[PDB]
C-alpha cells in the first residue's frame, strides 16, 4: 500500500531552517513525484513544490529563494528544507503523492508535521491523574505545561478507544500548553481492568505512562 | 494565481439529508478541480478528481459536478462520519491553489451533558499548583455554561475551556472546564463546585466536592 511517513513535529527558532524527511513505501521515487504542501492559519492550504521522478524541482513563486527539495531514491527518502522561518511559517507541513506520475491530484498524504516557529525552549509535560470517584465512571489524564504542540495520547497502548475524548490543547498565560484526555468506562470494571494513558511529547522526547486509579 | 471561493463558510444539515458545497473560480478552469475531506486531526483525503471523476475507496454518496467557474461537491445522504471540512483545488493554472473550505456540521437531537468533577491530584499539589477539572460529556448542541464557585465565591478569569469537535458517531460534543489556582489558595478553601447550564437540562446541574473528603 502507498504510504508517506514524515519526521516528527518540532520547534524551529525564528530566522532558522526547517528540515523534514518524507520516507515513502509502496512505490518508487523513480516512478513518482513527491509534492510539498502546507496548511497555515494565515493562508490555509498552500502548495510549496515538487521533486519529480527525474530529480527536477519546481517551487511555488514565493519560495524559490528559501526552499530546497532533494531525495535519495535508494533510501526512498525525500528531503525538504526551507530557510529563514518567521512566525507566520508556523504550519502543518505535508508531503504528498499524486495518482499519476505527472499530475497534482493528491491521493496520498503524509501524516503532516506541525512546525512551530518560536524562540522559546522545548518543555516536556507533567502527567496528572483525573481519578474516578448510573454505573458509568469517568477518568482521565491532565497533560500539563508543555511546548510546543503536539502531544499524543492514547489509552491502554491503543487497546482502549471507545468513549475516549482527547481535548484540544489550550495555551495558558505561561505560554505553555495544557490538555486533558478522558474516557468513560463501566464502574464495575475499575477493580478489574487497569487504565493507563500513554502520553508522548515528541518535541521533548518525553514519554509517560500514567496509571489512573480511583482515589483511596 | 486563481482564487477559489468556497461557500458557504458553514453548512449545517441533518443526517440523511442531501448537501452541496460550492467552489467558485476567479476565471474559467475547465473541469480541473479536485475535492478533499479533512477530518479532525487528519490529513486531506481526496474525494473527487477533475470535477466529477470518482476515487477508489470513496463512498458513492460523494459526487461532483460543474464546469468553467462554478463547481459543486454533493453528498446525497449525509452520515455522521461526514462531519469534516471540505476543500476544493484547481490545477488548470500553475500554481495549483486551494479554496478556503466549508465546514460541515450535523444537526441532531438535544442531549444533556453528563457532568463529572475532578479534584487536583496529590501529585500535582506537590508542584504548588492545583487544577480542578470539570467534564461535560456527550451533549448537544454546543452551547453550554460552566460556572465555578469556591466557598460560594463566584470564580472569574481563572478557568479555561476546551471543546471537542463533533463526534463522528453520535454527533455530540464534550467540554472540559479547568479551574487553576495556586496550592496556597486551594488549601485555604473547602467547597469546589462547577454548575453546568444546558438546553437539555431542565435545571442547572451542580457537581462538587469538599477538599480532603
Amino acid at each position: 500500500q502507498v504510504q508517506l511517513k514524515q519526521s516528527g513535529p518540532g520547534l524551529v527558532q525564528p530566522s532558522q531552517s526547517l528540515s523534514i524527511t518524507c520516507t515513502v513505501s509502496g512505490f518508487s521515487l523513480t516512478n513518482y513525484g513527491v509534492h510539498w504542501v502546507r496548511q497555515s492559519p494565515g493562508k490555509g492550504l498552500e502548495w510549496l513544490g515538487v521533486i519529480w521522478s527525474g530529480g527536477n524541482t519546481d517551487y511555488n513563486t514565493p519560495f524559490t529563494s528559501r526552499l530546497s527539495i532533494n531525495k535519495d531514491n535508494s533510501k526512498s527518502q525525500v528531503f525538504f528544507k526551507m530557510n529563514s522561518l518567521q512566525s507566520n511559517d508556523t504550519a502543518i507541513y505535508y508531503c504528498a503523492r499524486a495518482l499519476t506520475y505527472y499530475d497534482y491530484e493528491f491521493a496520498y498524504w503524509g501524516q503532516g508535521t506541525l512546525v512551530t516557529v518560536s524562540a522559546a525552549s522545548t518543555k516536556g509535560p507533567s502527567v496528572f491523574p483525573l481519578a474516578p470517584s448510573g454505573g458509568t465512571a469517568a477518568l482521565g489524564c491532565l497533560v500539563k505545561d508543555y511546548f510546543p504542540e503536539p502531544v499524543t495520547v492514547s489509552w491502554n497502548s491503543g487497546a482502549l478507544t471507545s468513549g475516549v475524548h482527547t481535548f484540544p490543547a489550550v495555551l495558558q498565560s505561561s505560554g505553555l500548553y495544557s490538555l486533558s484526555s478522558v474516557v468513560t468506562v463501566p464502574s464495575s470494571s475499575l477493580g478489574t481492568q487497569t487504565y493507563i494513558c500513554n502520553v508522548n511529547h515528541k518535541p521533548s522526547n518525553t514519554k509517560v505512562d500514567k496509571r489512573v486509579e480511583p482515589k483511596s | 494565481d486563481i482564487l477559489l471561493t468556497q461557500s458557504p463558510v458553514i453548512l449545517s444539515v441533518s443526517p440523511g439529508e442531501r448537501v452541496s458545497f460550492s467552489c467558485r473560480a476567479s476565471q474559467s478552469i475547465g473541469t480541473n478541480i479536485h475535492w478533499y475531506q479533512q477530518r479532525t486531526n487528519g490529513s486531506p483525503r481526496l474525494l473527487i478528481k477533475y470535477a466529477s471523476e470518482s476515487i477508489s475507496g470513496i463512498p458513492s454518496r460523494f459526487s461532483g459536478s460543474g464546469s468553467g467557474t462554478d463547481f459543486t461537491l454533493s453528498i446525497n445522504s449525509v452520515e455522521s462520519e461526514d462531519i469534516a471540512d471540505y476543500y476544493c483545488q484547481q490545477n488548470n493554472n500553475w500554481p495549483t491553489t486551494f479554496g478556503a473550505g466549508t465546514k460541515l456540521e450535523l444537526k441532531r437531537t438535544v442531549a444533556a451533558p453528563s457532568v463529572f468533577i475532578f479534584p487536583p491530584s496529590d501529585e500535582q499539589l506537590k508542584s504548588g499548583t492545583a487544577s480542578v477539572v470539570c467534564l461535560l460529556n456527550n451533549f448537544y448542541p454546543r452551547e453550554a455554561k460552566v460556572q465555578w464557585k469556591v466557598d460560594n465565591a463566584l470564580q472569574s478569569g481563572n478557568s479555561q475551556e476546551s471543546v471537542t469537535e463533533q463526534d463522528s458517531k453520535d454527533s455530540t460534543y464534550s467540554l472540559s472546564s479547568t479551574l487553576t489556582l495556586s496550592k496556597a489558595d486551594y488549601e485555604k478553601h473547602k467547597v469546589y463546585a462547577c454548575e453546568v447550564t444546558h438546553q437539555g437540562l431542565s435545571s442547572p446541574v451542580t457537581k462538587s466536592f469538599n477538599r480532603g473528603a
Binding site: G44, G112, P150 | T40, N41, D85, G101
Partner: peptide, 12 residues
C-alpha cells in the same frame, strides 16, 4: 474564520 493548528479544523 480561523484554521486551527491543534485540530486541523475550521474554527468559526
Amino acid at each position: 474564520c480561523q484554521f486551527d493548528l491543534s485540530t486541523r479544523r475550521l474554527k468559526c
